[PDB]
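Holo model, Y7O. Inputs:
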Amino acid sequence: WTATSGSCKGRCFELQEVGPPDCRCDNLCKSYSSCCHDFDELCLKTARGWECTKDRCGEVRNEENACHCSEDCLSRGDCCTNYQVVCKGESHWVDDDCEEIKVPECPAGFVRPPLIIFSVDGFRASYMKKGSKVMPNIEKLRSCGTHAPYMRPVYPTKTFPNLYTLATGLYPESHGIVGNSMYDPVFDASFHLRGREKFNHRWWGGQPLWITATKQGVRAGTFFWSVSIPHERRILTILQWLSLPDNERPSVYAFYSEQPDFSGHKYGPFGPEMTNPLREIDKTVGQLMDGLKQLRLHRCVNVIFVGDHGMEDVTCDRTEFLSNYLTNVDDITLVPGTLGRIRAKSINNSKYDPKTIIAALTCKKPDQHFKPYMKQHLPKRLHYANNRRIEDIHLLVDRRWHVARKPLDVYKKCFFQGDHGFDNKVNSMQTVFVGYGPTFKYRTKVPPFENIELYNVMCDLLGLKPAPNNGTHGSLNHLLRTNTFRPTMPDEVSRPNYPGIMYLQSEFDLGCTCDDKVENKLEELNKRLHTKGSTKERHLLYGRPAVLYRTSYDILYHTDFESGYSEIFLMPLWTSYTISKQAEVSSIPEHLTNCVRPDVRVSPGFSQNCLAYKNDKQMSYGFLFPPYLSSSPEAKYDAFLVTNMVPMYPAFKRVWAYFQRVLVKKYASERNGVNVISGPIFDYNYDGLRDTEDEIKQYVEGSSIPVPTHYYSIITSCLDFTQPADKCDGPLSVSSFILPHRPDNDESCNSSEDESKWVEELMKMHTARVRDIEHLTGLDFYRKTSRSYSEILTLKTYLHTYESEI
Ligand SMILES: *[C@@H]1O[C@H](CO)[C@@H](O[C@@H]2O[C@H](CO)[C@@H](O[C@@H]3O[C@H](CO[C@H]4O[C@H](CO)[C@@H](O)[C@H](O[C@H]5O[C@H](CO)[C@@H](O)[C@H](O)[C@@H]5O[C@H]5O[C@H](CO)[C@@H](O)[C@H](O)[C@@H]5O)[C@@H]4O)[C@@H](O)[C@H](O[C@H]4O[C@H](CO)[C@@H](O)[C@H](O)[C@@H]4O[C@H]4O[C@H](CO)[C@@H](O)[C@H](O)[C@@H]4O)[C@@H]3O)[C@H](O)[C@H]2NC(C)=O)[C@H](O)[C@H]1NC(C)=O
Ligand SMILES: Cn1c(CC(=O)N(Cc2ccccc2)c2ccccc2)n[nH]c1=O
Ligand SMILES: Cn1c(CC(=O)N(Cc2ccccc2)c2ccccc2)n[nH]c1=O
Ligand SMILES: [Ca+2]
Ligand SMILES: [Cl-]
Ligand SMILES: [K+]
Ligand code: NA
Ligand SMILES: [Zn+2]
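Output:
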C-alpha cells in the first residue's frame, strides 16, 4: 500500500527518494506503484512532440508542451534539443568539424567535467562498421574520440550480468547477478526479468558506481529508466538536471536504450528490420549532443557510448533437447537457453547423481551442439564458478544454438531470430566502446579490452576512489589524455634462497634411479657457471616473477632453464625458459626413459620421491622444462632432476607431452623464438585465487606432494617478430593458458584420435590472461622490462581468443 494522493508539482524526476506511503516522483515510482496521481500529467508531457518548428520560435511559454521553443527556455533548461538550430540559425553538432578538446571548456561553477554513460543493449561490435552509413552522430563520436574495435562482455553474455559488471567492475560470480534468471538455494528464491523479486537488495553485491559516487560526495542522476518513458524524455531529463544549480547538479549521468537488443531478438542481428533501430539510436545521440551544445557543454562533458553484449542468429529449429539424452529428464530443473544450468528438481531426493547426468550428456551425438561441465571445470577465463547461485552442472552451448529440457518447453512456455548469452570470446557477442570528451584522447584507436576494466576508468573520470574490483587499475590509462591513477608494482613479500651444492647423493632415499653414471676442466668450469646463473639472461627475460605471499622457496639455475622451487609445495612455482627459432627438438634417449635424479641443492625432506608415484596407481608425473628441448645431451640430465618433476594423470600427460614436444617448437618457429613460463596452479575451492597449503584436497598417495588442479604457461615473444624473443627492443606479444589437470579427456570428444586432432583445440578453449595466472599463483610477472608499467598492465590483461577478424 501507498497513500499515492500528493503532488509532483515542481518535483518531476526528483533526485532523492521520499519513503512511502508519501507519493514519489523519481523514475522508479512506476516500478513500485507509488507515483503521485499527477505524475503522468506533469512529468510525462508529450504535446507538440520533441522538435521545434519555425512557427514555434519565440512562442509564448505554454507549460503543457513536452519541450519549449520560447525565449526563456535556455535559462529554464527545457528547450527542445533542436531549438538553437531551428530558431537561432545554429548547426547540428554532427555537422561541425571536430576539433580536439585539449582542456575542459565548462561553464563557471562546474567543479569537474560531467560523465554521461550512454548504454545500448545488444549493440554488437560490427554494427560500428556495418551500419556506419546510418549512424552519423555515433560515427563522429567514434572517429573523433577514443574507440576500441570491440569490447569483451563478461560471461554469461546476458543483459543484467553485463550492465551490473559495467557498474561495479566485478565478475558476475562476485557481484551476484549470474544470469537473467537465477535461483538462490539459501533464499529458496527465484530472480527473473518479470517480477518483483529482482528489486530486493539482497541479490546485488559489490558497490555500483552511483553508490561509490554518492559516498564520496559526488552526486549521481538515476541510472534506471522506466520502459515506458520515451528516449526523448530521458534525454530531456538529463539536460534539465545539467541546468540545475551547482550544489544540486549531478556529476554522473546514465542513459539506457532497450534497442537494438529488442529488435535483434525478433529479426536477428542483421535483419533488414535492424536499420531503423540503429537510425533511432543515432537520432537520440544527436539530440543529446545538440542539447549539450545548446548548454555550452559539448566540450565539457565526457561521454561514454557502451554496449552490454552483441547478438547472434538463433532460431527454434536449432534447439537441442535434454529429453533426447536423458531418461530421467523430469528429475532435473534446467535454466535453459544460450547456456544451460542443471540442478535437482527436488533436494529431498538422495538418488540424484550429477556424474551420471554429466556422463549421459558427454559426446553422445556426433554433431552435439553443447558440452556439459562441472562448473569448476569451466575455462578459468570465464570466472564462472564461485557463487552458490551457479549450479554445479553447466552446459556451454554452441553459438547459434539453444538448449531446452523437452520439446514442450519450446512450443508451450518460431518467436525469435536472434539471441545472446554464449561464451564471451565469441565474435557475435562482442560489443562497443567509444569515449568522447576532454579527458579521453583525440582520434585514438585502442586495442580491444574487457568491460570489467571500465569501473576503474569511470572512477578516474570523476576523481573517485574505486571500491575493490576485478579491473586492473592502470590497464586502461592509454584511453586517457590525463590520468588520476599512477599504478605501482606490488612489493615482493618473499625473497628467494639461492642454494648451492649441499647434499651428497647417498643422503637421498627417493626410490629414484637414473642411468647417469658416465663421466675435463673445459666443460667443468662451464657447468659450474650454468648452476650460478650465467645463462640466466637468456632464459629469464623479464626478471624473476615476484612472490606476493609469505613462503619458502629457492631459485634454481640450469643451462636450459631457471626455476622458483617451493619447499612448501615440493615443486616449482614457476619454471622459465627460452626456445629460439633455431632450436632443435630431440627425443629422450632409451636409457634415460625412467630417469629421475636427486637435486644436491635441495634436501631430501623438501623433495618429491619416486616411490609415491609407484604406489599411486592413478598418478604419474611429467616435467616442467621438457627434456625434448634440452640444448645438449649433457644438459638433458638437468631436465630429469626431481625438482623439475610435477604430478600428472596419464590422461593429462597426453596433452602436456604434445604441447612440450610439438607446440613449443611451432610457436618458436612462427613467433621467432618464445620465452615460456610454466607451473602448477592449486584452486580447490574454485575462487580464482591461489590456495593456501591447508586448502589442498588431493595428494599423490602416501605423500605430502599436492596435486595441481591446473597447469599454466605464459608464452612471450617480440611484437615485432623480425626481432628474436631474446633480443626485443620494443613491445611484447603474449598468449597464455590454464589447462585443467584432469584424470580423463572426456572434455574432448575426439581424444581417441592423435593429439594433432584435439589438443590444440582444447588449449584454445582454455586461453587465459597473464592476470588470471597472477591471481591463481600469487606471482607477479614482467617485473624487469624496458616497457612502461601501464603498457605491461595492458599486456597482462590481454586475451588471445583464436576467433577470426571481427
Ligand atoms: C574480484 O574482485 C573481488 C572484490 O575485490 C574479489 O572478491 C573479494 O575476495 C575476498 C577474498 O575472497 C573477500 O574477502 C572476504 O570477505 C569477507 C566479508 O565480506 C563481506 O563484506 C564485503 C565488503 O563490504 C562484501 O563485499 C561481501 O559481499 C559478499 O557476500 C554478499 C552476501 O553473502 C554478496 O551479496 C556479495 O556478492 C559478496 O559475495 C561474493 O563474495 C563471497 C566472499 O565474501 C563469496 O563467497 C560469494 O560467493 C560471492 O562471490 C561480504 O558481505 C570476510 O569475512 C573474509 O574474511 C575471512 O577470511 C580471511 C582470510 O584472510 C580471514 O582473515 C578472516 O578471519 C575470515 O575468516 C573467517 O571466515 C571463514 C569463512 O567463513 C572461516 O573459515 C574462518 O573460521 C573465519 O571465521 C574475507 O576477507 C571479499 O569479500 C570479496 N569481495 C567480493 C565483492 O566478492 C575477488 O576475489 C576478485 N576475483 C578474482 C578472480 O580475483
Ligand atoms: C536493486 N539494486 C540494484 C539494481 C537497481 O538499482 N535497479 C533499479 C531499480 C531499483 C528499484 C526498483 C526497480 C529497479 C534495477 C532493479 C531491477 C532490475 C534492473 C535494475 N542495484 N543495487 C540494488 O540494490
Ligand atoms: C536496465 N535498465 C536501465 C539502466 C539501468 O538500470 N542501469 C542500472 C542497472 C543496475 C543493475 C542492473 C541493470 C541496470 C544501468 C544503466 C546504464 C549502465 C549500466 C546500468 N534503464 N532501464 C532499464 O530497463
Ligand atoms: Ca582458491
Ligand atoms: Cl540466464
Ligand atoms: K603411478
Ligand atoms: Na574423450
Ligand atoms: Zn536481449
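The chain has 23 helices and 29 strands. The pocket of calcium ion (ligand 4) is lined by residues 683, 685, 687, 689, 691 (CB under 6 Å).
Archived with the compound record.
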